[PDB]
């Protein structure tokens, strides 16, 4: 016997699930594979950085954008596509000149702020980052060899006593050690990296931004505030001082755990054992979940503070950079946030040992004892938010459709206004006690209106429901009342049969699949809020309390330039935006059939098609189907493929709209 066509999907669904590998027999192999994969991924990141730097160096106009950044537009890379018109000139080129694309990433402001002035510096930087990619791959090879050499040194290893087998658990102490990793991460990788970047700023960035000054004196460490007037960005001296302070704090903190000597520092196990934790820190899924849950606030605050307090030169002067960066980082942090819950569920399925029935000692145990209370209250708050946001929006829509704008229910956002007032009083007290006052903070505090209150309630509803689905999946991954053996099965499995009431979407993976739709919807709400407030603050402040305003004055109204991109009147430089808009609509709708239509129909359809192929004159004498038997996609594969189509469509439909509306 052999396999069917579903082998490809089955293999690719766990192609990186190194725990599911067949040759892997021990944590040594798993940890070494993960470490080597980390090295390869770092190489990929470095090559990507070098790629962007090269294309800015070669197929771009950094040397000219740096001179007049406010009205100029950067170039991403050239367009070489043989499908364009070999005659005339495309709307993306100045007549006979080559074809170009406008960069919406923001690397131009990054390099300008960091101190780049010439193309030659960018070329040297590209070369150095390619060198670093080589170094990373060679480090991967080095560590593979060192661990294989330890394994070979077990050919000259014996304790002369039966305790020699204890060495089995310490072979991967290089990777699995936690105290040393925490100490050196928090100290070196955070604090000293910040201190080195402060040195970079003081040596290059501040010297290459103003007239020549003293030999990088300590007057380069200022405490001004935000939004230097000329470049509309944070003071580079303030940034250097901030990185210096963070570096000092994290360097001091990095001396906490017992890393290299047994006589200094406290152990993480003893820290947890005397607190409300003591979790299984040897689980890789648990660590991954709680660090993905750490990159999530970091990325969300990155999205918030790149816009609110623009740190790069002339970044606020670009109407497309500011929206694209915020939306990108919001989507990245939403993905990481749902990742944290997905891997928490995988941790509970795979890497969690629980007491017999009643020992309420582990934190997961105490959570599982009253998990029903958690889920019931999360459902209650989700229901309240949904009911009272949709109902008030419906009131506003109905009363404004009935020619009565004054009959709306507009709750003044008093709590957010109080927080803003307190923060503004603090900031104004800071500013008034300065001999160099009249500072600006850009959008750190923004006008808050009833529309803001309603949108914040909608966002809270989305977050609550996403957390509800993910938390329910995590807590009932090991067993629910409907299926009280769920931890005997895989993390993702089809169903439990039509009996016992019917059990579609019962696995924890199915809970993740359901929660990804709500993650996408909440992110869409957040991005729509930001983009609408960005396009017209006045119209958002007044007419955003009724959903018809969102439907008309934002979606229908702002989609005018994009659809007009390519038509029977000529093309604009938004032609790619409109074409990708339609393509992403097609991708989004194509995944509906993988979600709505389920397997058996298609399996019968595939049986009919296979009947045809085994009935066609020439095919039957070459291919009997016994080798790679065509079969319909399995249930979990179908749900995942539909989810991928839906996610791709929903995500990639937005950047064309952003570019058409802002540019």
């Amino acid at each position: 016997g052999r396999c069917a066509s579903s082998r490809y999907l089955q293999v690719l669904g766990s192609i990186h699930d190194i725990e599911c590998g067949f040759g892997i027999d021990n944590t040594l192999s798993l940890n070494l594979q993960i470490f080597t994969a980390h090295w390869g991924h770092l190489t990929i990141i470095l090559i990507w950085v070098s790629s962007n730097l090269y294309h800015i160096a070669s197929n771009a106009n950094y040397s000219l954008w740096v001179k007049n950044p406010i009205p100029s537009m950067p170039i991403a890379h050239n367009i070489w596509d043989p499908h364009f018109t070999n005659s005339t000139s495309t709307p993306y080129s100045h007549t006979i000149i080559t074809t170009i694309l406008i960069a919406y990433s923001g690397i131009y402001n990054q390099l300008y702020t960091s101190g780049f002035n010439t193309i030659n510096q960018i070329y040297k930087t590209t070369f150095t980052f390619s060198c670093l990619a080589v170094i990373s791959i060679l480090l991967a090879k080095i560590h593979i060899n060192t661990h294989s050499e330890l394994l070979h040194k077990l050919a000259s290893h014996t304790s002369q006593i039966p305790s020699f087998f204890q060495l089995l658990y310490f072979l991967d102490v290089a990777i699995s050690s936690v105290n040393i990793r925490f100490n050196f991460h928090t100290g070196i990788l955070v604090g000293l990296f910040s201190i080195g970047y402060t040195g970079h700023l003081l040596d290059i960035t501040i010297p290459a931004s103003r007239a020549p000054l003293i030999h990088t004196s300590p007057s380069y460490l200022t405490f001004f505030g935000g939004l230097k007037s000329n470049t509309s960005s944070l003071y580079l001296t303030d940034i250097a001082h901030h990185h210096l302070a963070i570096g000092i704090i994290s360097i001091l903190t990095g001396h906490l755990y017992s890393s290299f000597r047994a006589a200094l520092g406290t152990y993480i196990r003893d820290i947890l054992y005397t607190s409300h934790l003591t979790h299984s820190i040897k689980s890789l899924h648990l660590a991954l979940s709680l660090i993905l849950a750490s990159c999530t606030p970091l990325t969300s605050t990155t999205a918030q503070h790149i816009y609110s307090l623009t740190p790069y030169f002339y970044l606020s002067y670009d109407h497309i950079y500011s929206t694209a960066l915020y939306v990108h980082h919001s989507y990245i942090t939403s993905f990481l946030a749902i990742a944290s819950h997905a891997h928490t569920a995988i941790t509970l399925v795979r890497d969690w040992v629980a007491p017999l029935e009643q020992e309420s000692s582990s934190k997961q145990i105490r959570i599982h004892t009253h998990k029903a209370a958690i889920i019931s209250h999360l459902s209650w708050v989700s229901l309240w938010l949904g009911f009272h946001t949709l109902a008030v929006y419906s009131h506003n829509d109905t009363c404004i459709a009935f020619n009565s704008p004054s009959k709306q229910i507009l709750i003044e956002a008093s709590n957010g206004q109080l927080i803003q007032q307190a923060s503004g009083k603090a900031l104004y007290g800071t500013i008034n006690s300065i001999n160099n006052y009249n500072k600006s903070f850009d959008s750190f505090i923004h006008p808050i209106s009833p529309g803001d209150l309603y949108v914040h309630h909608a966002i809270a509803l989305g977050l609550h429901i996403t957390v509800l689905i993910l938390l329910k999946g995590g807590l009932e991954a090991r067993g629910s009342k409907l299926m009280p053996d769920k931890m005997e099965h895989s993390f993702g499995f089809s169903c439990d049969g039509p009996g016992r009431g019917g059990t579609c979407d019962i696995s924890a993976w199915d809970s993740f699949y359901l929660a990804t739709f709500w993650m996408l919807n909440s992110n869409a709400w957040i991005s729509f809020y930001f983009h609408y407030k960005h396009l017209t603050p006045r119209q958002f402040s007044e007419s955003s309390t009724y959903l018809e305003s969102w439907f008309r004055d934002y979606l229908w109204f702002n989609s005018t330039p994009l659809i007009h991109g390519y038509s029977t009147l000529g093309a604009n430089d938004l032609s790619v935006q409109s074409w990708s808009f339609l393509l992403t609509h097609l991708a989004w709708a194509s995944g509906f059939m993988f979600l709505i239509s389920w397997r058996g129909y298609w399996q019968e359809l595939i049986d009919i098609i296979l009947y045809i192929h085994l009935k066609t004159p020439i095919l039957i004498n070459l291919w009997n189907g016994d080798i790679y038997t065509p079969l319909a996609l399995s249930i979990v594969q179908a749900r995942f493929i539909g989810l991928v189509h839906f996610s791709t469509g929903l995500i990639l439909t937005y950047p064309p709209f952003i570019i058409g509306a802002t540019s």
């Binding site: 030999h215 990088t216 004196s217 300590p218 290299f260 000597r261 006589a263």
Partner: protein, 186 residues
């Protein structure tokens, strides 16, 4: 046993042990007693050399960078380092002086190199204990071969070091308060 059985705690009236530790740090920190004795001996040796070189420059002054090599013993540190950029940071924009750079940072880097390949190499790599606390195996051939002679020589080193530490503190404080010569008096 007091302080892990270290030399230095014995009284001079004999038949008695001063075992001076009013704060009781020896019993509070028995795992850092070798480090405590390392620090005590390092302070004592540095203070001996410091007192000798606090007295000597009042008579002879090496003829060198006139920016330093001049003034009272008090105005000899901040003068022999000059207005460095922030602290012990060489000015790479204008090496060769012409405004601000150190004159002792050479002593600083020599001390750092010696210290790292000295104490740090003694503790971190493949080991200091109670007995080999200040023992860097420097001039041990001069140490007599007798169990009590080595002990009394170590005791004399320790007591001279403590006396030199207190003496340097007093000498530098009096010099700052008054100036003056070797007596360091008003």
């Amino acid at each position: 046993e007091f302080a892990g059985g270290l030399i230095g705690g014995q009284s001079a009236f004999a038949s008695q042990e001063y075992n001076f530790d009013p704060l009781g740090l020896a019993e509070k920190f028995p795992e850092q007693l070798p480090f405590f004795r390392e620090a005590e001996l390092k302070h004592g040796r540095i203070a001996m050399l410091a007192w000798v070189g606090l007295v000597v420059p009042e008579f002879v002054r090496i003829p060198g960078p006139e920016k330093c090599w001049q003034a009272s013993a008090v105005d000899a540190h901040s003068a022999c380092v000059x207005x460095x950029x922030x602290x012990x940071x060489x000015x790479x924009x204008x090496x060769x002086x012409x405004x601000x750079x150190g004159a002792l940072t050479q002593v600083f880097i020599f001390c750092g190199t010696l210290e790292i390949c000295g104490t740090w190499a003694k503790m971190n790599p493949m080991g200091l204990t109670m007995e080999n606390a200040g023992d860097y195996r420097l001039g041990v051939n001069f140490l007599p071969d007798e169990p009590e002679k080595v002990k009394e020589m170590k005791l004399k080193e320790l007591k001279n070091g403590r006396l030199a530490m207190l003496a340097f503190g007093g000498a530098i404080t009096q010099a700052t308060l008054t100036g003056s010569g070797f007596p360091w008096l008003y």
